[PDB]
Design a protein around this ligand. Structure first.
Ligand SMILES: C[n+]1cn([C@@H]2O[C@H](COP(=O)(O)OP(=O)(O)OP(=O)(O)OC[C@H]3O[C@@H](n4cnc5c(=O)[nH]c(N)nc54)[C@H](O)[C@@H]3O)[C@@H](O)[C@H]2O)c2nc(N)[nH]c(=O)c21
Length: 133
């Protein structure tokens, strides 16, 4: 599909369902800094400072956390969700964001946050662009 310009992401959150011991804080800020630069260079800037960044565990944590976000940050445009490989967390993240609260969500694998590549960050910017485009 065609790329959309005029997109600016200012209020976004990070929900890390991957264990901290595997996907540490430096991994998160590094992944975020890289994402900021390439989304900037693509004309769809994502501000390098998320309004929220926390670790969580289990599908059951999803609804409470999303409800919390929705009630705390007005204008919240996106929730970047880090998953630890295949997990029911994904289904739940989608069930809650799509059919329950109307919240845009973008999932990404933990391995791609631990080790970023220009191609993966690119795939991400494209999926994100389609979603808020
Ligand atoms: C643990 N885990 C991680 N992933 C994660 O999935 C993430 C990104 O999701 P996403 O965050 O980018 O949002 P989505 O809406 O869901 O993708 P979405 O935008 O809905 O997909 C759109 C695709 O749907 C297809 N589609 C929709 N409408 C049509 C149509 O009319 N025709 C055709 N041919 N296809 C269509 C379309 O072709 C398009 O390719 C990755 O980072 C993985 O780590 C998992 N995925 C599955 N299925 N199961 C898991 O357990 C799992």
């Amino acid at each position: 599909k065609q790329f959309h310009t005029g997109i600016e992401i200012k209020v976004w959150a990070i929900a890390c369902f991957a264990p901290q011991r595997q996907c540490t804080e430096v991994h998160l800020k590094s992944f975020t800094e890289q994402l900021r630069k390439i989304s900037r260079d693509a004309g769809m800037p994502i501000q390098g400072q998320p309004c929220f960044c926390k670790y969580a565990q289990g599908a059951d944590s999803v609804e409470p956390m999303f409800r919390h976000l929705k009630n705390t940050y007005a204008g919240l445009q996106l929730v970047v969700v880090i998953l630890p490989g295949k997990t029911p967390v994904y289904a739940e993240v989608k069930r809650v964001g799509d059919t329950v609260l109307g919240m845009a969500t973008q999932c990404v694998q933990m391995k791609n946050v631990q080790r970023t590549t220009p191609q993966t960050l690119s795939n991400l910017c494209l999926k994100i662009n389609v979603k808020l485009g």
